[PDB]
Amino acid sequence: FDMGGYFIINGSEKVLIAQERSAGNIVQVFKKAAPSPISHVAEIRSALEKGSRFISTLQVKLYGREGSSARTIKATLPYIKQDIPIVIIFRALGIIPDGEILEHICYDVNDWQMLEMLKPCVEDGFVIQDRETALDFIGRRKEKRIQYAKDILQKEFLPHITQLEGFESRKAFFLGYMINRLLLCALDRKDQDDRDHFGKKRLDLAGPLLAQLFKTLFKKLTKDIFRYMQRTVEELAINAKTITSGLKYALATGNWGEQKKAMSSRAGVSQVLNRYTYSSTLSHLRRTNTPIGRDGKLAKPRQLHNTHWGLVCPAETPEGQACGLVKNLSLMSCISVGTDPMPIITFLSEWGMEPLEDYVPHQSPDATRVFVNGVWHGVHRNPARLMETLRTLRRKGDINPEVSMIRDIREKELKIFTDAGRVYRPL
Amino acid sequence: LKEKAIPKDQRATTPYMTKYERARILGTRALQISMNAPVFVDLEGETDPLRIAMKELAEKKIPLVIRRYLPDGSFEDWSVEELIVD
Amino acid sequence: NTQPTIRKDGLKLVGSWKLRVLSTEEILNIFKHISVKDFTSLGFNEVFSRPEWMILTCLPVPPPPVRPSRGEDDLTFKLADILKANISLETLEHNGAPHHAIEEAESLLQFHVATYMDNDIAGQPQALQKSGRPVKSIRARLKGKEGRIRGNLMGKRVDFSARTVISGDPNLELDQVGVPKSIAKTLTYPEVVTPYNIDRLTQLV
Amino acid sequence: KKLMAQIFFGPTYYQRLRHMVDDKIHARARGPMQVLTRQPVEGRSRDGGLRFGEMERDCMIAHGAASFLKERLMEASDAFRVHICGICGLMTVIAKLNHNQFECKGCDNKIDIYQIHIPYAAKLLFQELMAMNITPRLYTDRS
Amino acid sequence: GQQYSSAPLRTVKEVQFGLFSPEEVRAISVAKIRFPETMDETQTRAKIGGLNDPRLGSIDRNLKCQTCQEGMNECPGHFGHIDLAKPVFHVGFIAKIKKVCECVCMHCGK
Amino acid sequence: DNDEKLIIRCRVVDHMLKKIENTMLENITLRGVENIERVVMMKYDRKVPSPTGEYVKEPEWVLETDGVNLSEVMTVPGIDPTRIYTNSFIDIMEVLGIEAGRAALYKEVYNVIASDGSYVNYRHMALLVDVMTTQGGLTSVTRHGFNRSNTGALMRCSFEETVEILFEAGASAELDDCRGVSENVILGQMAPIGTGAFDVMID
């Protein structure tokens, strides 16, 4: 009757508790509080899936209160002190004319409201009217200034789109998309983004946790190897204890780190399997945590959200402190595991998706945007045909059945997710 | 200061014994009686120190004196004998 | 004389002065020559509290009962820290050390005394101890719900106590309480022997 | 005789849970005490004391039971007696009881000495303040 | 039990706070904590005169001290000192220190 | 008002017209009081003595606000300036004085308790609001409030910010009275509480 799913560390059975986080590379708009100088914000926490999983955070801030005039839009970029106005970014990405910029932001020329809201930004960066001077406007301690900006634009700005050079167009269009939804919220056209939708949440399971730990210690072993190489300049001295003892310490204590107390703040990640009854074990093997906090009157994360239906159990959660922050997976609920999007992207390009560089908004206005893992890859006209093809492929098996595909008709969007860690259920 | 007393004629605290001073009086006497100290009443078949103190209190043979303090530093002395118990 | 606009940094004080930093000897010998009257109008007492005593000249060691051990306290960890840093400054004194090695010795001697008094401070010099554990400071030791005041003075574990599961009984008096026999044999009242109880007391013994 | 009430009566799945008295029951008179604070140890498994928490201090205050309160905090937990100097009101005094000699180094005092009963946690507290450079002076009389 | 003491037992009625003068910590400390190490040298079965031995209190539960000859049950720990090579601040008073330094003239003492 | 479109035409006597427009839209008050963002008419079935003498229900129209400016609303015609009330007892303290403060503070505490059907005797909440107001104005029961008083030293540090109080006591050379109860429980002495509010001696 044993079900597996646990580890045996120094003799004791140990479980990994699914760590719940918010998904990366998804853009959300947040209204700001009543006394804030800034009115709304568009946020993306940009994550690189493969490689160093560092997270950049780009803010697009709409300055000015709801009754104030001179309402400007500025962006926050990872290594420059001041927010810089959006048109200066745009021209630093090679999009010089005001009209081209607005075309990147506003996808309908008959929306005089949004363009009227944009007027103060065109006035804000009227002083900067070539690409090179836009790159120059950068806070450092002369030519090296321009070079630092050029580097930042592809290195730390929108890292999830790409970090290779020459794709300023994709990042310009995506920045414009973020600005568009910012303004959509500011015009009372779309509502504030709900941060407690389960779809925007991710469940780090045993695999990802072990992978995050293994990356860290493998690079420590690698650095040790390099140091032993340098030491032997003139004369297989690999320390397997590093990997072994590190994995064991994490699985034993539950502090997900290499001998760090508070730096590996996620603690209790690994706990002793409960063996009191069969069902106690079964349940403990499907527990989730949410570390966002342990103490406080956190009304909204603790409440059963509508989207929890079918994936998380309504009834089963602790009482008292950690009520609602500790969840239990429904019976048929499953968790995605990770899939190569590259085949999907190639098929999309092969079946109608025009790329973002060749996208010309005023020349194809009624055109569905196509996203794959929060990346705007291009545009598609006739999305009904493409969507039918994609669904028939997934159901045939030719597209991985855990990949998710949503056609938002009324906003002309198609979003495909090959993510790891999103809860799904059969139907 | 120096002899912050009060004359018995000019006394303004309750002539009744507070519950707290009855409790402390009874406790102190039951302590004195738990150690083999002389009892000044005829213990008619009673052995518990506390009930000895209570009976001594009913017949007002407990010779202690409360020193009630008023917040300035003055005090009124009050014999357990004169105190009303109710 | 013109006087500087003072500001914080770490745990030393620097002033714009319409430029440099202010030694501990600096501020302290300013503090020796202040007239007594300005002490007292500044809220200080000439006998117990003088601003020259805010600075630390020589540090009192607490005895082992404050810092007892099979193990070794963090307080003596940090006391040994302070002492070897101090004797290192003494050595660098005696050996005519360079111009800004004395600043490392000084700055960390003060860091160590600071962390020994109180460890949680802004600028986040965490001051972790053996086994990567943050040094428990005297401040943090007597602070908090489980700290010395709230935990061992305003409340404490006590003798002659008991605890267990409760249930109800239709047939006890309201002022009664049911004591299990095991508990009732575990707890004792001290009773001085007297003629009135001596027989039942001998029986009990 | 029949019950006038009829009764709801039938099978029903019941469960025996982990909490059972004989694993919870606990009682202690004058057991072992801690090293640092010299107050009772914590835990039924170590024959420990129950906590007289400050909420219970509150209740005992509201009741007015002053001496029972002082009892819980002193005789049932870490009472202690220290010798202090009559001028520098600090626990500095070197007292040998076998030879009846009390001294205060620095102050040069040998005749104005007092002894006082405080919690050992309190003696700790004052020693820790002294280690912290704060001088907690304790004097017998108001002045 | 803590034997009998000739010292009169009174109660505490006043607590006068203040700060430690250097001179008084000199005058109260029965030992110069010169050496950091707890244990006596060569890792022996003893406590070194350097820090944690000298008559601050016993550590082997043996009735020896500075003019106490009392067990650990009866000995309140005795204080010592360490001369710092050059003055250093107090954390809890940095704020206060700067504030008083905030406005008092460097040259004149008022 | 007859014309079915309501239009206003304004010329100056071009970008500064937008500034005149912003000033107009945001910072011109047509009517009303500076902070009163909403007002509602309700009926209250108040009881008042009849000419015969026995009390009777005489319902009255009352206006309930959605904001507070006590000073300016109170000075308005048609209202009863003696009966005005706000649930912002701190505005009451500022305009009508500390004692009016005390009264409104008690009213609001009483209302939070009675809202739940509970009842607590007058004297307990009375003592609470008395201690909060016995100083100049409004002292709160949190670390900024009662705990920065002249309340000795040790009692003070038994609540919050422990070691900082102790340090300030060192520096300012505070003298502790040791008549506070927390002081005596710290020294294991009998506190001047009901049993120890007096001495005993013999005849």
Add this chain to the structure above:
Amino acid sequence: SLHKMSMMAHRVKVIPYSTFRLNLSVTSPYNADFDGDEMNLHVPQSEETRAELSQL
């Protein structure tokens, strides 16, 4: 312990089994229930503190 009524003096009745036992009409002041609740007992060691329990 939110009440002065959370701590009350009782008369001891030594009884066989492993639980503390009390009368139903004392549950309300304690907010007691018999669903797993535990309770704590303290014993005076002086004559006058005995008195303080019994008289207050």
Add this chain to the structure above:
Amino acid sequence: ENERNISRLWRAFRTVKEMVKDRGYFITQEEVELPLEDFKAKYCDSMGRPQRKMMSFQANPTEESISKFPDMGSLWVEFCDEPSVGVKTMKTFVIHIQEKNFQTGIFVYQNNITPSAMKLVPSIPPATIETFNEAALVVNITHHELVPKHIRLSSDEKRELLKRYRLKESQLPRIQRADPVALYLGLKRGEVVKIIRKSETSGRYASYRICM
């Protein structure tokens, strides 16, 4: 269409008369309830405009007030038609008050007061001059439900108060010097006022506060 301003000015006048009558000054009751038309008659000019330097009037202590405080006397209230009183408008007022040897002068103003004037307020050591604002005085705060009777104590009444409760000055409850009613009666620091208040438990209860 500014009989609004007329009525508000008149109500401030009624309340200042009520204040100085309540402070222990000889003001008639028939005098204070002057109806609005009579106010217009006396102090509105030929333009219907009210000019409020004619409003200013000298109040004298009652007989009882010199029985209980011999040194109360010579108060003259001055209204100002110059809005936003500047420091040298107060110059005007302060040296008016000093020249005639007046113990207390109350200076009602309109809309505003410069801080430069505020500093020269305690200029003359014996004389005391108090600054008010019409918008405050349009309503008599002491008429309000939640405001019970404050009664300034004489010096000997405060000494008796202290002796019979065996009190220290610091043990007494406190009233803020700028407390609205403390201002309405011109409370000076150290002066005690006794407050008679309705009581849910005893019907009448008397508290005491001292000025800080």
Add this chain to the structure above:
Amino acid sequence: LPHFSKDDYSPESKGFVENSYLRGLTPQEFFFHAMGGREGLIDTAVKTAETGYIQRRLVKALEDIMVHYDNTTRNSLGNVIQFIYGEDGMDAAHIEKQSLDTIGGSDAAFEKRYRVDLLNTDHTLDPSLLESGSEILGDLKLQVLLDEEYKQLVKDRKFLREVFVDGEANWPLPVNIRRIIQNAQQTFHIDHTKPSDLTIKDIVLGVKDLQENLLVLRGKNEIIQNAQRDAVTLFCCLLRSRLATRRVLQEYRLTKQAFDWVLSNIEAQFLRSVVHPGEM
């Protein structure tokens, strides 16, 4: 839920359980009900800690307040917080909600209930209620004391109507007169037929004496004597309304011994009801 179409503000769509627990909830009702119950549990789980901290702060802020031996309510430094505890010096126990019967009712009913005119053949105490019933007509010297009593009753009613503006009559007060009167009726087996033996002077002068003997403070100076009369004002209102001549003689049928017993009882209970110095 994804089982509903968009823009559906229906009862069942937005969380109305039309089913009872007996019949059973449907899946959507189950989930919506779970959504509500979770909010309940979290409200529980944090209100617990918030009220624990609130109680802690209340206690540590008030912990030093105690009734002193002059009944002032003070603190550690002796600062006065209340000059008399609870504004009436009474212990919060032995205090019961009794009604003040001169509040409320018509003035017609009021005077029918408490007015007696020995100078009016229709409004004097009938001889069925008093041994001195028919000597009592005329007698301006007894009508002066009765007029004094009635005038006080009137002053009390206006005072009480201006304290409790709503006209509320029942308030917590130290001595339950109602039960003392029933105790008197039972002890002495009053038969409600034979007339009393109380002189009008008996009742009137006795009630006034009783008001004199209701001490809460005892210093013999005018400050504290006025404090004393302030403390007992409400209670003396209740007392006068309860022990008024027509009431004692016609509603109750107290003999002189039962009435004197009522007086001694009220005194005894009252002085018991004072707070004890040392009370925390």
Add this chain to the structure above:
RNA sequence: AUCGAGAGG
């Protein structure tokens, strides 16, 4: 001891 985790009213 220390850090942490689960649980009980």
Add this chain to the structure above:
DNA sequence: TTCTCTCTGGTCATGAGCCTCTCGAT
């Protein structure tokens, strides 16, 4: 020009129900 005046974001910072248990790595 001086001086006193308002007067707000980056901070640093506070506690955060009581017990009570048991376990488990360093």
Add this chain to the structure above:
DNA sequence: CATGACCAGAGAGAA
């Protein structure tokens, strides 16, 4: 977690 005072800045009146 999350609610909020203290400067430190800089715009901002008066004589």
